[PDB]
Amino acid sequence: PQQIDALRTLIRLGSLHTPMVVRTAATLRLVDHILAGARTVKALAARTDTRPEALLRLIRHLVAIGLLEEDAPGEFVPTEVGELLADDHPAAQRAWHDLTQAVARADISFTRLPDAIRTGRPTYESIYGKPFYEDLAGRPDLRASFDSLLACDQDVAFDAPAAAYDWTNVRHVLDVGGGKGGFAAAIARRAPHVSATVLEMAGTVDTARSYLKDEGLSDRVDVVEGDFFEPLPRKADAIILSFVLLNWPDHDAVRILTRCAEALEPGGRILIHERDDLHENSFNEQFTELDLRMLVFLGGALRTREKWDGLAASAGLVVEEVRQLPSPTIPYDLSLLVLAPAA
Amino acid sequence: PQQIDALRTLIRLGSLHTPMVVRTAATLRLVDHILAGARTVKALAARTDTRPEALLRLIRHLVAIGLLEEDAPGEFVPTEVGELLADDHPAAQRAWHDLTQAVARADISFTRLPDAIRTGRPTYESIYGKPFYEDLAGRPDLRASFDSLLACDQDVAFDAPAAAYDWTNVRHVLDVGGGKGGFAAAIARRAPHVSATVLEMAGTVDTARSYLKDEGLSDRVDVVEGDFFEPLPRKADAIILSFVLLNWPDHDAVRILTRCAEALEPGGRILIHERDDLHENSFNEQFTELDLRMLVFLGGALRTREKWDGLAASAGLVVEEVRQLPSPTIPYDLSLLVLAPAA
Numbered sequence: 001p002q003q004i005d006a007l008r009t010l011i012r013l014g015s016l017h018t019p020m021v022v023r024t025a026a027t028l029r030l031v032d033h034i035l036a037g038a039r040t041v042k043a044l045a046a047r048t049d050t051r052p053e054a055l056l057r058l059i060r061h062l063v064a065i066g067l068l069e070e071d072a073p074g075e076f077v078p079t080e081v082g083e084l085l086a087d088d089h090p091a092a093q094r095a096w097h098d099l100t101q102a103v104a105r106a107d108i109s110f111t112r113l114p115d116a117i118r119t120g121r122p123t124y125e126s127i128y129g130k131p132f133y134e135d136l137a138g139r140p141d142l143r144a145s146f147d148s149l150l151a152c153d154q155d156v157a158f159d160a161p162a163a164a165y166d167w168t169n170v171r172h173v174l175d176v177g178g179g180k181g182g183f184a185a186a187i188a189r190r191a192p193h194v195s196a197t198v199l200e201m202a203g204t205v206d207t208a209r210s211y212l213k214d215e216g217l218s219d220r221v222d223v224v225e226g227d228f229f230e231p232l233p234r235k236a237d238a239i240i241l242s243f244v245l246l247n248w249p250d251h252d253a254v255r256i257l258t259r260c261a262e263a264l265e266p267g268g269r270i271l272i273h274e275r276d277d278l279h280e281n282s283f284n285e286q287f288t289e290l291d292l293r294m295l296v297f298l299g300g301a302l303r304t305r306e307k308w309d310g311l312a313a314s315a316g317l318v319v320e321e322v323r324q325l326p327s328p329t330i331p332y333d334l335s336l337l338v339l340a341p342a343a
Numbered sequence: 344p345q346q347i348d349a350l351r352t353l354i355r356l357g358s359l360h361t362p363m364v365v366r367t368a369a370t371l372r373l374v375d376h377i378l379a380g381a382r383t384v385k386a387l388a389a390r391t392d393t394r395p396e397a398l399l400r401l402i403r404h405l406v407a408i409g410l411l412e413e414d415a416p417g418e419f420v421p422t423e424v425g426e427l428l429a430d431d432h433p434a435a436q437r438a439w440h441d442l443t444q445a446v447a448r449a450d451i452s453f454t455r456l457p458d459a460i461r462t463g464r465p466t467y468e469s470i471y472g473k474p475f476y477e478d479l480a481g482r483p484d485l486r487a488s489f490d491s492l493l494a495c496d497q498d499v500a501f502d503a504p505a506a507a508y509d510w511t512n513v514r515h516v517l518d519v520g521g522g523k524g525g526f527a528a529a530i531a532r533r534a535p536h537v538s539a540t541v542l543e544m545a546g547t548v549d550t551a552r553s554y555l556k557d558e559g560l561s562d563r564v565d566v567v568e569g570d571f572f573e574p575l576p577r578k579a580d581a582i583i584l585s586f587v588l589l590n591w592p593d594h595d596a597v598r599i600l601t602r603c604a605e606a607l608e609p610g611g612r613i614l615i616h617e618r619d620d621l622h623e624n625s626f627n628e629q630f631t632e633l634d635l636r637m638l639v640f641l642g643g644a645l646r647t648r649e650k651w652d653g654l655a656a657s658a659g660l661v662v663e664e665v666r667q668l669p670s671p672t673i674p675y676d677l678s679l680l681v682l683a684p685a686a
């Protein structure tokens with residue numbers, strides 16, 4: 001028959017057990033345990049304290065989808081795909097699929113995706129009892145997990161956007177929602193004359209300060225606890241919004257942008273580090289995974305290039321320049337948008 | 344880079360939003376509405392009462408994964424894969440992905456798959472408040488949805504297993520857990536001398552009786568409400584277990600098989616309609632989807648050919664014959680296992 005391939009494709013795409021099998025394997029650290037020598041069901045069950053027959057049934061699906069393969073009778077090893085769940089693999093896919101860590105936990109919000117399409121509003125609170133950042137505020141362990149997921153490569157992940165801007169006429173930088181300070185730190189190393197301030201929430205400010213202390217940068221990058229919907233704590237020649245605005249619906253993103261514009265020194269610029277696909281180029285899996293996560297986690301949104309033009313104008317700004325940022329590590333297209341005050 | 348394809352494969356397999364996007368589209372009947380003429384976001388939002396920008400964001404992922412394509416600017420149509428979500432397509436994939444119907448609703452149990460691997464026990468009750476069949480018993484609408492999902496092709500789905508057995512020396516058939524009576528009805532049509540009894544739960548017995556009345560078979564197939572862990576209501580030359588034993592862990596499946604053996608007339612046989620892959624042949628997506636659903640819904644299990652040999656022996660039975668059943672419609676390998684009393 002001719003629709004057999006189509007039927008197989010639809011069933012795979014619609015399968016909820018397959019991603020949960022991947023995330024279960026990640027959460028149980030199965031691939032790590034296999035690499036450390038536990039190749040049989042009976043050894044792996046003892047290492048994970050799972051029930052042996054139930055673990056075999058999980059492993060069977062892991063083989064079926066090509067993450068594991070049966071080497072010898074009853075002995076399993078990771079494939080090239082499965083090896084990506086090793087804890088120290090540079091793409092960090094084990095942690096990003098670990099159900100006890102903040103993002104895969106938040107992905108359970110997708111079980112109520114019909115509600116989010118009807119309302120345009122997040123479903124996270126309906127599952128976990130508080131909106132996303134309030135939940136993180138009440139669970140410092142999840143706050144720390146989220147911060148480390150985003151900041152994993154922060155020793156070098158922010159080098160490209162910091163190198164993509166000319167800091168010669170910048171004296172003070174304000175990184176609004178600046179995470180653990182990785183972006184501020186990368187700017188400080190590249191532009192030694194610059195002083196920087198990180199504005200962040202409780203909890204995150206402490207690991208930011210602690211990170212900057214380890215880096216020897218406390219004298220050049222300070223950390224302020226605060227709320228970026230309130231007046232910003234100081235003015236700056238460059239104000240950074242790195243993976244901030246996508247957390248927020250249009251009206252909140254305009255309020256944040258407005259606060260930033262109000263805090264700009266003369267000649268200053270606002271720097272947005274995010275995606276900016278043209279609408280025509282946005283029908284791709286990288287854009288939609290992040291965009292739909294922002295919907296169900298937060299009620300935020302990724303913005304196409306067209307929408308950035310509109311959002312800037314609403315905040316009194318113009319898009320002066322968009323710099324494409326190289327990710328020759330793993331292809332994830334990101335941009336640095338440079339916004340200036342409108343005429 | 345060389346691990347780009349591997350990384351892409353892992354991320355797709357681990358994506359929870361993609362199957363929820365498919366199920367959301369199925370639940371909103373999006374493909375039906377498109378085929379009826381609503382091709383734009385603005386028309387489809389009004390037909391589904393969703394928020395237009397949020398619906399566009401869903402559609403974007405549906406295009407990205409190849410269920411929809413943008414025909415004209417802002418107009419979307421289903422692909423060959425997407426057309427399978429039309430409500431009347433014979434593979435019934437819309438209903439099987441509809442979150443308001445019993446199976447896709449039960450698939451939310453997979454969000455707690457780590458618990459099921461640790462315990463070997465279902466997670467359905469922890470989500471919905473009662474174990475699977477008790478939940479169906481308290482929600483007659485879900486009971487009816489489940490019964491119709493399984494019985495969809497019952498006018499012809501049971502023709503092959505009914506044709507695969509020689510009914511010449513059978514006088515009475517008992518179909519234990521016989522659903523809406525489709526299998527009993529197919530036997531009655533092929534073997535007019537046979538009389539049959541369907542044993543089923545509350546609710547299901549009424550739609551079974553109603554189905555058999557529509558078929559003109561009330562005089563030949565009767566329906567008894569009861570519990571197949573209790574003594575069976577009568578003896579039979581052939582006792583049918585069609586998609587029953589996989590609902591149950593080994594010790595419960597032995598109890599059901601034992602009840603059946605105790606009710607067999609001399610010379611009688613027990614007929615099992617299920618999968619029976621050799622363990623070596625079971626590392627495939629058809630086996631694992633059903634097997635893992637039985638785990639999280641019910642604590643049941645699919646049994647490999649080796650396990651059937653063991654289960655039969657535990658119940659005092661031998662596997663006399665296994666007949667492979669043709670499904671040239673869509674390839675789903677099923678078998679008819681014929682069990683006889685052990686020597």
Ligand SMILES: Nc1ncnc2c1ncn2[C@@H]1O[C@H](CSCC[C@H](N)C(=O)O)[C@@H](O)[C@H]1O
Nearest residue numbers: 150177178179200201226227228242243244
């Ligand atoms: N009202 C608020 N005031 C200040 N910071 C906030 C805030 N709401 C959210 N945030 C911060 O916004 C950040 C978005 S995550 C991005 C972190 C970092 N800029 C990076 O690129 O990786 C979070 O760290 C969160 O703590």
Ligand SMILES: Nc1ncnc2c1ncn2[C@@H]1O[C@H](CSCC[C@H](N)C(=O)O)[C@@H](O)[C@H]1O
Nearest residue numbers: 493520521522543544569570571585586587
């Ligand atoms: N304790 C019990 N006693 C009798 N029937 C039961 C039962 N527990 C579950 N069942 C029935 O077992 C059936 C399994 S579903 C299979 C239905 C049908 N034989 C078919 O092949 O499609 C359900 O219809 C359910 O109502």
Ligand SMILES: Cc1cc(=O)oc2cc(O)ccc12
Nearest residue numbers: 103150243247289290293332
């Ligand atoms: C880059 C990226 C990918 C993703 O899948 O989820 C995210 C969530 C965030 O809060 C910030 C960034 C990302």
Ligand SMILES: Cc1cc(=O)oc2cc(O)ccc12
Nearest residue numbers: 446493586590632633636675
């Ligand atoms: C044949 C089949 C496929 C599936 O995916 O789920 C099922 C669930 C049941 O209770 C009975 C049969 C099936």
